[PDB]
Amino acid sequence: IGIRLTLPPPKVVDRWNEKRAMFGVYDNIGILGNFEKHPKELIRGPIWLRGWKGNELQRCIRKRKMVGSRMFADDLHNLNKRIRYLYKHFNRHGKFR
Amino acid sequence: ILVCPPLRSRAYTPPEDLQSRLESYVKEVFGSSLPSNWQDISLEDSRLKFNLLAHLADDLGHVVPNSRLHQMCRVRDVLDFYNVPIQDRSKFDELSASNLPPNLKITWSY
Amino acid sequence: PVRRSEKPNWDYHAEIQAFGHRLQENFSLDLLKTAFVNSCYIKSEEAKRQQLGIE
Amino acid sequence: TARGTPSRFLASVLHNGLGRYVQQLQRLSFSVSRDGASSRGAREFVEREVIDFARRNPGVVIYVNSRPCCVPRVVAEYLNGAVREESIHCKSVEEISTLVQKL
């Protein structure tokens, strides 16, 4: 049997949050703040992909270039093997060549 | 200190002396003559338009909305607006006040 | 099982009127409402109002 | 399949067309929502067509409950006692009119 016997506790969500109410504020800052900032300078994330979409191979290459001088050892080796595998995949296997 | 003047109904019924009242307040606001077509003069002058619509909204209680504030170019247009009338009963109050048959009952759990 | 009078969607006057109408007949509704009561129901309702003592 | 479901013989309920024809429908119990997009077709049905439907065949008693529900329904009760409950969840006005006419 997979199904649960009792229905779950009620998940109550506050739609008038602090974060939900001011979502999208200081977006659209460049257009009507005479272009002092870009809207991509509002992004808060990893230091390599802040305003950059990328592939899986391209994300790994960019992370190795911008950060891989200060990564941990096992994480750096795993990133090396991932870039090797993804090069072998994208440039040799698949349909549509 | 200034708390709670009561809410006002949105319903409206235009009175029967609407023509005399409009001509009286146009004579009062514009300070001009009748000559031939009082209901064809324009309201591009925004001070005169504001004085007319503010005086009417003070008197009759209904006020022109913004989407209809756009479309008033003549006094014929505000005369055609003040013959519209609307009604602010609920849906259930309007439904039970229709000619319901003897075999249709409705209830409201709200 | 319970009577249909005790389930939620129920109105007596509309049911008597529809009972008159679906048989394609014209009953005078007072005589039909007279016909649907019973002597046992009368005695039981007065027994219920007297065990509680309500006039 | 026919071996897996029950079966009955073709029958009238109480010899309808012999004497007088009687409408075999007793009730229609409607439960629609005030707010909620799933009950929009039923909301418009209660607006425009249930009054003419009630005037059309007066043997039927119609109830509209107007209850908060994620799926609106119609319960059709017949003379022999059977109860048929159908969902009018996200349907047109024409589909609901077809459904209550077939019921």
Next chain:
Amino acid sequence: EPVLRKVELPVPTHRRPVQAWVESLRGFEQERVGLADLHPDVFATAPRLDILHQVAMWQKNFKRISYAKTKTRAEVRGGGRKPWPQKGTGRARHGSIRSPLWRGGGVAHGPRGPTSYYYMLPMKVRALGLKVALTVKLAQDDLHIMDSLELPTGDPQYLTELAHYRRWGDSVLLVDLTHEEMPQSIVEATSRLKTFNLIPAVGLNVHSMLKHQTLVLTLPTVAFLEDKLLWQDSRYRPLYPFSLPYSDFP
């Protein structure tokens, strides 16, 4: 005396301006203290809900970075040698544990790394979305334009009772400009309310305008909006980004 606000930008030869009432917040029923007209290219564009959907979904998804990650079959711990050699026993051929078939294996096609979803619309599309959303807020009788946000008291019950009396809505987005001339009364009022919001005019956006029921602008705000949004019409190619000098552009 009445407050009249004529548009200072040049209108086209046809296409006369659209108007709106000027309310205030000092009194309790002080609506209709003046009458303003607005630029029809900003407040009367075509309704265009496709552009609303484009800018709304861009605004929701361009900031998103999802930090989901699972371990592939090369990162799960262990799994080196070949268990039960290829031809001897009668089990199924396997070359490593932690292959994705096994319990405790790595995922075959799972999420990979912190993935970004960044893309930018052309700026004319975003400005067109703002003009479209202002027009949609006007035509459905939702927009209200004030002379100055100033309450007499500065307590939130006054603000919510006034918004109830004027039949605005359950939520309302209040806009002032420049974030420093916001007076103390409205700030101390709406700093506690949960559905009423103050933003500077730089932070106007399609998502907050759709999320809140009405939208309350100011007369310096509507002049600012007309200038910044009409500048996209009649503008050249960039030639370098507009933060650089450009003799006309401040």
